[PDB]
């Protein structure tokens with residue numbers, strides 16, 4: 179089977195935690211994280227990819243009004259590249275597309291979607307590929323004040339997908355199975371920017387409902 183636990187931070191696949199600000203660009207941060215993990219696997223180099231590039235240029239999404247990660251992967255594919263954060267830095271508002279192919283740091287060969295609501299499939303994809311872009315319900319104040327432990331709240335609504343984050347691994351803590359979740363609300367949020375979310379507790383917060391990863 180797949181390993182009982184996995185943590186792609188220990189493999190050097192995950193860049194530091196970012197702060198998206200109040201632009202609704204969670205989808206772009208989610209997408210770049212997935213891409214970052216696949217680029218590391220491909221080239222051996224860890225580097226920051228450009229969420230702004232996605233915000234300004236993914237005409238199928240709505241910039242700071244939100245988007246889907248699948249749309250973003252498709253754009254990187256059709257565009258034949260995504261810029262680095264250094265070449266195309268984050269400013270947290272919408273601007274006209276300024277993609278420059280000379281600053282290209284990664285490509286994409288399409289994407290795959292995890293079978294809806296299937297936490298075993300999500301687990302096996304993480305294990306086999308690397309970090310996976312996920313959508314969740316993050317609307318409860320209990321989520322937003324998270325400090326420690328494995329997060330579980332029965333009021334989480336798996337049909338209310340209102341935030342996009344990154345699953346960088348999974349495992350267990352005091353007997354509670356979990357997903358290791360990189361947020362994009364800065365290092366002062368949660369535990370150094372991260373949250374452990376309940377795993378195999380009936381698809382808590384819709385964790386496995388809109389999960390996808392890029393091919394490279």
Ligand SMILES: *[C@]1(O)CO[C@H]2[C@@H]1N(C(=O)[C@H](CC(C)C)NC(=O)c1ccc(-c3cccs3)cc1)C[C@@H]2F
Nearest residue numbers: 202203204205239240244245246313339340341342
């Ligand atoms: C995110 O920063 C968290 O709060 C904001 C941002 N957000 C999203 O980006 C959503 C992420 C999904 C749950 C994965 N996506 C959307 O809101 C969204 C908006 C618009 C589209 C379009 C499809 C065709 C044209 S525009 C798709 C997805 C939720 C909230 F807005």
